[PDB]
């Protein structure tokens, strides 16, 4: 240890005008202490089995050297507080050094954790190692498929199940897709799957089989082991088409259903922004394919709430910057949509979907950057759309902020 | 010498008997897949045919001839192997 | 195994008339390749003449027969009965020869060897995009042999427009984050052909037509 902090120590305590060679006595001999308490501090860690020099080592390290663990505070008796160690200080170099007594006690306590439980497992069967969750892991010969017939029927009972003729079988299998760790080198004929299901499953709308393509894509993304980024290039048209595409089937009901799968498709398009992102590849492409839809004229009610939905859901700068300038072509639009004298067409249900879509989102973004004064009419210069009710949706999120 | 391939061995003559990382490759960063998207359209065998191994798997760019003096690898003869795993072959 | 008589003498006759004799014969030669159903069992012999005569252009640096036999690898394409897919392995490496090798050419400065250029970057633009399957890794291992061909300094000019003619010929997003990093390259090229130590080699031709 420095000299230079020793004669700190020591002027501060009241014991001025030490030597150097005075000082330079102090500085060996608690320097060998440390040195000393180190070395039997790490048999405790060597003992106990966690080559992690833990803080209770050198408590025991202290009380085997017949010193106190005592920390901070030295008990010339010795009857109050014997080797029995206090856990140390919890202090800090970039601390406050002044808290507020009443900030300790309203702070919610940490959970308590799991008790210790013993579960088995098999590191080895007779000789190979199982790939458990537990666990690390002239003519040519008639060539043999890179699955075998176990893993193959696996495959065909996941996608039987996929299919959804009963709930709880997919929900089984959407769980086997979600944690199986071997269920890489199965994943080219997944994805492909999928995404040939996808296109000549929406030559006839069938929403369905859709809902549960979408819910297997999801599922494949969870899980930790396997490598997508290879496969996103199949995944992202199929979970985009859940998004912009035209119902052949019956469009007005359904549509319930519809709505929920363009946020579907809203949710894979966040997960796209999310995860496997490098530069100016993916997100910035399908974030350009989606205002090419919106800018796109007559865009389609369908099509039109999907990509709607889909800018959506991107987080909080991209409707910060993007939904900004078009309030008005939507008012336009659902104005036209109002002035008809036919409904025997989807054009309303999916303008009044567009409508309370937009609207939420401009509450908050609203909510976000911005004072909540003059809530009656000032929306009014935003051509009037959700005003009061948008101001009531703004006060909603401020009771909920409280509540947080 | 004389089996397919033939005609070129007799006219020859010959008697005897950061931007290189793997991602930016990946078809996901290099494909206008937004095109795909369809807006307004108007077991005792395998049921996925065995691939060809040696496409999936051999080095085929192994044969490409980058430069004809300069060749890192002499190449041989190639014999026919009439592999029997294709169908619509009699044999 | 052993072909029979018949096809025998049709793989004869379709192959010599893709030679040279008349261009008439060459047509229709072609446009039997390409419209038969039944030439499957003649695939291996095919592909099989196809890389040895692209390799016998180095003996004899014949730019006339190479454009026939990527006339003829172009014919194959076209055929919807015959699936190229088990042979494919064969042909990519020899269109590939026709793109990025450096002499193309007898007379290396009258001879257009430009065409076989575009022409097999198209060729190859088509079999990768019929052909490329994830299992397969074509299209990328083709862009990436087109790149560190095209990165790489001290590659000829003659090569270098062959990759760029290959990675402009597969489409818009590998000329977005290929070729227009290395525009500056376009200096480096400018150097030799507005000023240029020497102005009657054959480098000025190249470098142009590069530009």
Same mark, same amino acid.
């Given at each position: 240890?420095?000299?230079?902090?020793?004669?700190?120590?020591?002027?501060?305590?009241?014991?001025?005008?030490?030597?150097?060679?005075?000082?330079?006595?102090?500085?060996?001999? $608690?320097?060998?202490? &440390?040195?000393?308490?180190?070395?039997?501090?790490?048999?405790?860690?060597?003992?106990?089995?966690?080559?992690?020099?833990?803080?209770?080592?050198?408590?025991?390290?202290?009380?085997?050297?017949?010193?106190?663990?005592?920390?901070?505070?030295?008990?010339?008796?010795? &009857?109050?507080?014997?080797?029995?160690?206090?856990?140390?200080?919890?202090?800090?170099? +970039?601390?406050?050094?002044?808290?507020?007594?009443?900030?300790?006690?309203?702070?919610?306590?940490?959970? $308590?954790?799991?008790?210790?439980?013993?579960?088995?497992?098999?590191?080895?069967?007779?000789?190979?190692?199982?790939?458990?969750?537990? @666990?690390?892991?002239?003519?040519?010969? /008639?060539?043999?498929?890179?699955?075998?017939?176990?893993?193959?029927?696996?495959?065909?009972?996941?996608?039987?199940?996929?299919?959804?003729?009963?709930?709880?079988?997919?929900?089984?299998?959407?769980?086997?897709?979600?944690?199986?760790?071997?269920?890489?080198?199965?994943?080219?004929?997944?994805?492909?799957?999928?995404?040939?299901?996808?296109?000549? @499953?929406?030559?006839?709308?069938?929403?369905?089989?859709?809902?549960?393509?979408?819910?297997?894509?999801?599922?494949?993304?969870?899980?930790?082991?396997?490598?997508?980024?290879? +496969?996103?290039?199949? !995944? &992202?048209?199929?979970?985009?088409?859940?998004?912009?595409?035209?119902?052949?089937? !019956?469009?007005?009901?359904?549509?319930?259903?519809?709505?929920?799968?363009?946020?579907?498709?809203? !949710?894979?398009?966040?997960?796209?922004?999310?995860?496997?992102?490098?530069?100016?590849?993916?997100?910035?492409?399908?974030?350009?394919?989606?205002?090419?839809?919106?800018?796109?004229?007559?865009?389609?009610?369908?099509? /039109?709430?999907?990509? &709607?939905?889909? %800018?959506?859901?991107?987080?909080?700068?991209?409707?910060?910057?993007?939904?900004?300038?078009?309030?008005?072509?939507?008012?336009? /639009?659902?104005?036209?949509? %109002?002035?008809?004298?036919?409904?025997? @067409?989807?054009?309303?249900?999916?303008?009044?979907?567009?409508?309370?879509?937009?609207?939420?989102?401009?509450?908050?973004?609203?909510?976000?950057?911005?004072?909540?004064?003059?809530?009656?009419?000032?929306?009014?210069?935003?051509?009037?759309?959700?005003?009061?009710?948008?101001?009531?949706? $703004?006060?909603?999120?401020?009771?909920?902020?409280?509540?947080? | 010498? #004389?089996?397919?391939?033939?005609?070129? #061995?007799?006219?020859?003559?010959?008697?005897?008997?950061?931007?290189?990382?793997?991602? =930016?490759?990946?078809?996901?960063?290099?494909?206008?897949?937004?095109?795909?998207?369809?807006?307004?359209?108007?077991?005792? #065998?395998?049921?996925?045919?065995?691939? =060809?191994?040696?496409?999936? #798997?051999?080095?085929?760019?192994? =044969?490409?001839?980058?430069?004809?003096?300069?060749?890192?690898?002499?190449?041989?003869?190639?014999?026919?192997?009439?592999?029997?795993?294709?169908? =619509?072959?009699?044999?």
């Amino acid at each position: 240890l420095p000299s230079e902090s020793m004669k700190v120590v020591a002027e501060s305590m009241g014991i001025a005008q030490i030597q150097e060679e005075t000082c330079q006595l102090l500085t060996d001999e $608690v320097s060998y202490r &440390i040195k000393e308490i180190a070395q039997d501090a790490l048999k405790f860690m060597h003992m106990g089995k966690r080559q992690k020099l833990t803080t209770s080592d050198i408590d025991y390290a202290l009380k085997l050297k017949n010193v106190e663990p005592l920390y901070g505070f030295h008990a010339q008796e010795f &009857i109050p507080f014997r080797f029995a160690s206090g856990g140390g200080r919890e202090l800090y170099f +970039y601390e406050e050094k002044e808290v507020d007594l009443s900030d300790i006690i309203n702070t919610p306590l940490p959970r $308590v954790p799991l008790d210790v439980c013993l579960k088995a497992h098999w590191l080895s069967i007779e000789g190979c190692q199982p790939a458990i969750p537990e @666990n690390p892991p002239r003519l040519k010969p /008639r060539s043999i498929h890179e699955l075998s017939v176990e893993q193959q029927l696996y495959y065909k009972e996941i996608t039987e199940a996929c299919v959804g003729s009963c709930e709880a079988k997919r929900a089984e299998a959407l769980q086997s897709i979600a944690t199986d760790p071997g269920l890489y080198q199965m994943l080219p004929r997944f994805s492909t799957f999928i995404s040939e299901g996808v296109r000549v @499953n929406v030559v006839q709308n069938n929403l369905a089989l859709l809902i549960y393509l979408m819910r297997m894509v999801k599922a494949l993304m969870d899980n930790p082991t396997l490598y997508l980024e290879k +496969y996103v290039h199949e !995944l &992202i048209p199929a979970v985009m088409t859940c998004i912009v595409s035209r119902q052949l089937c !019956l469009r007005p009901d359904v549509d319930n259903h519809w709505a929920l799968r363009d946020f579907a498709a809203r !949710l894979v398009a966040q997960i796209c922004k999310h995860f496997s992102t490098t530069t100016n590849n993916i997100q910035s492409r399908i974030t350009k394919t989606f205002t090419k839809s919106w800018v796109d004229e007559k865009t389609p009610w369908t099509t /039109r709430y999907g990509s &709607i939905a889909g %800018l959506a859901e991107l987080g909080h700068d991209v409707i910060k910057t993007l939904i900004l300038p078009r309030l008005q072509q939507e008012g336009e /639009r659902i104005r036209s949509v %109002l002035d008809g004298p036919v409904l025997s @067409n989807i054009d309303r249900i999916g303008a009044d979907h567009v409508q309370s879509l937009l609207l939420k989102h401009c509450a908050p973004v609203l909510a976000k950057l911005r004072p909540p004064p003059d809530n009656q009419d000032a929306y009014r210069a935003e051509f009037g759309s959700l005003g009061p009710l948008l101001c009531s949706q $703004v006060v909603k999120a401020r009771a909920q902020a409280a509540l947080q | 010498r #004389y089996g397919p391939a033939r005609l070129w #061995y007799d006219m020859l003559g010959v008697p005897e008997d950061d931007l290189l990382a793997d991602e =930016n490759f990946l078809m996901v960063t290099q494909l206008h897949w937004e095109d795909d998207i369809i807006w307004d359209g108007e077991p005792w #065998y395998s049921i996925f045919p065995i691939d =060809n191994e040696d496409l999936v #798997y051999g080095r085929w760019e192994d =044969n490409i001839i980058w430069d004809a003096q300069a060749m890192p690898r002499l190449l041989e003869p190639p014999v026919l192997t009439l592999d029997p795993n294709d169908e =619509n072959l009699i044999l």
